RNA sequence: CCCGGUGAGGCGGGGGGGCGAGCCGGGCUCUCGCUUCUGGCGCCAAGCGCCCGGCCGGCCGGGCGCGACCCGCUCCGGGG
RNA sequence: GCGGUUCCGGCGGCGUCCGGUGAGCUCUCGCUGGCCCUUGAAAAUCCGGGGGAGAGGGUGUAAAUCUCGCGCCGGGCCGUA
RNA sequence: CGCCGUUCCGAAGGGACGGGCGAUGGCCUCCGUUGCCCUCAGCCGAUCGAAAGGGAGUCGGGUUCAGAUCCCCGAAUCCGGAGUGGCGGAGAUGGGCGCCGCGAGGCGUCCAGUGCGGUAACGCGACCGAUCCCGGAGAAGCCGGCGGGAGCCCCGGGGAG
């Protein structure tokens, strides 16, 4: 609809029942969840190696 | 104590309200658009007669400065009637014509008799 | 006893990482033009060469002397507008039925007194502006042999005379019970000002580079001295 | 009016919670979704900004 | 006096800490200031220390400091 | 086909039905492509999301709250042949 | 007289969730309003500029000598307001334990409750939330081909004149 018609529509008609729903596509919400999780794991992996290397040093 | 922003802005200072020693105008100006000024005279043409009989509508010539709200209140107080709505136009001769419709419980034909239109 | 849910959550403020805290930016603020002007004027007076006639006013009494001098001068303050009325009314009653010593204020009044040798001690504000109003007075007092001193604040001399400001004041006479106090001040003030007048008037001011410049010069020279020390080792 | 393309690059603001959009001259070989790095200690890679 | 940048946001000096060197554990030569895998996220403080208020040691709620080093005379550079 | 003052939104009966077709013309919606050393506005305005400072009641006479369904009031000024 | 200049040599914010001190009132219960202080705050450029650009929402019938998407009839719709802004519905109304009862259920306590469905795309009538942040829409040329829907035209029959 035209942008000023959205004002008189209920919320249900303007989004989707999902995180970021109505603003980001489903496909790229799945990617961000994996990317956020997978990247945060690598930080723990890299942090552990740094701690171990310092421990040896 | 410290500035967390690199920008200096003019600090807000007190602004007093006016307290005039004298009023610049001795007395307030009188209202020059009272009810008698707003309604000039009624229109009595063939079209105006049709409006009275068929549309429950009085036709008036009114001050060009008057708006529909002012026209409505003047008509109510001048003739003690009730107004449903008001339509206005400005004529090619510069006068403003008001199409005042009365509430369904008032008969424009009866009202026009009181005013002297008919 | 500590709740296991609580925990430390430190912020890392390295480049990248977390948004920087709200630290004090005072040094880097963009100030209004009038603030920049008066600060840049303070820096110029340090950066340039200040002639001795203007630089002599940076030499001022210490607080201990300036407190004794101001307590003595407090006993001879001019009568306020209010209490002149009472003196006048009292004279009216007395008439129906001698001038005590007082401070002399104003660069025009003090100047005439110094030239006439009628002044005993001259107190000069250090921050008169335009400075030409008094820039000549220290040299005049020295010529006439009138002891003079420089005091911090034309507002302090202003408070003495119940006005906003005063460029200079002068003692002409004191009560007998205060003659010793005046003598003690004069001897101290005379040594600092009248007897050093030869070196005061040949002592230029200012001519100091900014801290960053001085540090840069210090770093550059220290390199040579270390190399010179390492020349022989 | 310009022969060269322009790259739209987004940085984080180090002092405020914002995204900064810059408009660079696009060095040949850069692609969307690429990471570019600007500063004294950026690595010598095509598209990075270094002194 | 001029020029450029910026919402004039961390400049100079010192302190503090880390890896190296090397002289007979300490002092110094001297360097560094915590982000490079991915088309995520990232503010509006956690924690700690010290004071204070209200109600019945227990509840409810405030202030300061460290965290976020200190001192400085031009915002930072470039000219001159 | 009937009435009236007959200058009545007058009153009556019946009907307003069933299919086909097209590189047809006009408009429109959509899909897909080509062209550019041409890449083809801005803003008012409206919306969704991320976050979670807060608020709401102590099991009821329920509260904060609701972009849901109804209901209540108003929309002035100028142009208009 | 003025001119240049429109962010450039500028202390360019008169605002706000919230908090604390008071003052006034009223459906005086407690809430409004209001003054100050604290806190928070980029917009960065006054203003003008389009009856063909952007820009919510009105249609059918009748009616005049001359006006009608404006008048009348009928049927709608947008925006704004009302917390004395009213009524429904949602939030919402569950479970454990202990008594009483054959049971339906009823009492007393202790806990939950800022909705729910689908593997998913997403759906359902709502379905709390501020500073702040990200994004969408407004908002995008010209030409070709092809397809869908309409209006019109055409063809075959029923009526009525
Ligand atoms: Mg949320
Ligand atoms: Mg017309
Ligand atoms: Mg305008
Ligand atoms: Mg327009
Ligand atoms: Mg209407």
DSSP string, chain C: ---TT--------SSSSSPPP----GGG-B--HHHHHHHHHHHHHHHSEEPHHHHGGG----HHHHHHHHHHHHTTPPPPHHHHHHHHHHHHHHHH--PPP--EESHHHHHHHHHTT--SEEEEES--SSGGGTTTHHHHHHHHT--EEEES-HHHHHHHTTSS--SEEEE----GGGHHHHHHHHHHHHHHTTTTHHHHTT--EE----HHHHHHHHHHHHHHHHHHHHHH-
User: Do residues B99 and B57 lie in contact, with contact meaning Cβ atoms separated by under 8 Å?
Assistant: yes
Rg (CA), chain D: 12
DSSP string, D22-43: EEEE--TT--TT----BSTT--
Q: Nearest residue of C to residue B6 by CA position?
A: C29
Round to whole Å and give the CA distance between C63 and C151. Answer: 9
What strand order describes the sheet that includes C148-151?
A: C104-105, C168-171, C121-125, C148-151
Q: Is A33 helix (H, G, I), strand (E, B) or coil?
A: helix
Which positions ≥6 away from B98 have C-beta within 8 Å?
B59, B60, B61, B62, B68, B71, B86, B87, B88
Round to whole Å and give the CA distance between C169 and C162. Answer: 13
Is residue D28 within 8 angstroms of chain C, CB to CB?
no
Round to whole Å and give the CA distance between C162 and D36. Answer: 70
Q: Which nucleotide is nearest to D50 (CA to C1')?
A: E36
User: Do residues C125 and C169 lie in contact, with contact meaning Cβ atoms separated by under 8 Å?
Assistant: no
**CA of B25, C1' of E11: distance in angstroms:** 62
DSSP string, C2-70: --TT--------SSSSSPPP----GGG-B--HHHHHHHHHHHHHHHSEEPHHHHGGG----HHHHHHHH
CB pairs under 8 A between C and D: 9
Q: Please name which of B118, B65, B70, B76 lies closest in space to residue B101, comparing C-alpha atoms.
A: B76
Q: Please name which of B67, B48, B24 lies closest in space to residue B112, comparing C-alpha atoms.
A: B48
D14 to chain C, closest Cα gap in Å: 5
Round to whole Å and give the CA distance between B48 and B57. Answer: 8
Which positions ≥6 away from C172 have C-beta within 8 Å?
C101, C104, C113, C118, C119, C120
C-alpha distances in Å from residue B90, one per residue of B39, B97, C67, C101: 14, 6, 87, 90
Resolution in A for the shown PDB structure? 2.7
The neighbour count for residue A14, using CB atoms within 10 Å, is: 13
Q: Is B11 helix (H, G, I), strand (E, B) or coil?
A: coil
Q: Please name which of B82, B88, B93 lies closest in space to residue B59, comparing C-alpha atoms.
A: B88
Angle at Cα C70 formed by Cα C64 and Cα C72, nearest 5°?
110
The dihedrals phi and psi of D20, each to the nearest 5 degrees, come to -105, 125
**Exp. method:** cryo-EM
**CA of B56, C1' of F13: distance in angstroms:** 37
User: Do residues C21 and C12 lie in contact, with contact meaning Cβ atoms separated by under 8 Å?
Assistant: no
């Amino acid at each position: 609809v035209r942008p000023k018609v959205l004002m008189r529509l209920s919320k249900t008609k303007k989004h989707v029942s999902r995180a970021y729903g109505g603003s980001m596509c489903a496909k790229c919400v799945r990617d961000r969840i994996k990317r956020a999780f997978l990247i945060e794991e690598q930080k723990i992996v890299v942090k552990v190696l740094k701690a171990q290397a310092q421990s040896q040093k | 104590k410290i500035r967390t922003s690199p920008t200096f802005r003019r600090p807000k200072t007190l602004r007093l309200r006016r307290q005039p020693k004298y009023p610049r105008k001795s007395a307030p100006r009188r209202n020059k658009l009272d009810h008698y000024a707003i309604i000039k005279f009624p229109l009595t043409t063939e079209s105006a007669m049709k409006k009275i009989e068929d549309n429950n509508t009085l036709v008036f010539i009114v001050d060009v400065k008057a708006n529909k709200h002012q026209i409505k209140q003047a008509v109510k107080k001048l003739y003690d009637i009730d107004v449903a709505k008001v339509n206005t136009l400005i004529r090619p001769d510069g006068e403003k014509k008001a199409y005042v419709r009365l509430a369904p419980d008032y008969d424009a034909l009866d009202v026009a008799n009181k005013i002297g239109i008919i | 006893v500590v709740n296991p849910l609580f925990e430390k959550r430190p912020k890392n403020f390295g480049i990248g990482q977390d948004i920087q805290p709200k630290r004090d930016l005072t040094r880097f603020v963009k100030w209004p033009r009038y603030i920049r002007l008066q600060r840049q004027r303070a820096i110029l007076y340090k950066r340039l060469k200040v002639p001795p006639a203007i630089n002599q006013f940076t030499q001022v009494l210490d607080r201990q002397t300036a407190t004794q001098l101001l307590k003595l001068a407090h006993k001879y303050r001019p009568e306020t507008k209010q209490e002149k009325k009472q003196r006048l009314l009292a004279r009216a009653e007395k008439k129906a039925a001698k001038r005590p010593p007082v401070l002399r204020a104003g660069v025009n009044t003090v100047t005439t007194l110094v030239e006439n040798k009628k002044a005993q001690l001259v107190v000069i504000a250090h921050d008169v502006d335009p400075i030409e109003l008094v820039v000549f007075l220290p040299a005049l007092c020295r010529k006439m042999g009138v002891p003079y001193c420089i005091l911090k604040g034309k507002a302090r001399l202003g408070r003495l005379v119940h006005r906003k400001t005063c460029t200079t004041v002068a003692f002409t006479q004191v009560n007998s019970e205060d003659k010793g106090a005046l003598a003690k001040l004069v001897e101290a003030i005379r040594t600092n000002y009248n007897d050093r007048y030869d070196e005061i008037r040949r002592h230029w001011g200012g001519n100091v580079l900014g801290p960053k410049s001085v540090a840069r010069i210090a770093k550059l020279e220290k390199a040579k001295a270390k190399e010179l020390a390492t020349k022989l080792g | 009016g310009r022969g060269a393309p322009l790259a739209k690059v987004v940085f984080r603001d180090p002092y405020r919670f914002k995204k900064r959009t810059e408009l660079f001259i696009a060095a040949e070989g850069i692609h969307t979704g690429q990471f570019v790095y600007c500063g004294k200690k950026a690595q010598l890679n095509i598209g990075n900004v270094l002194p």
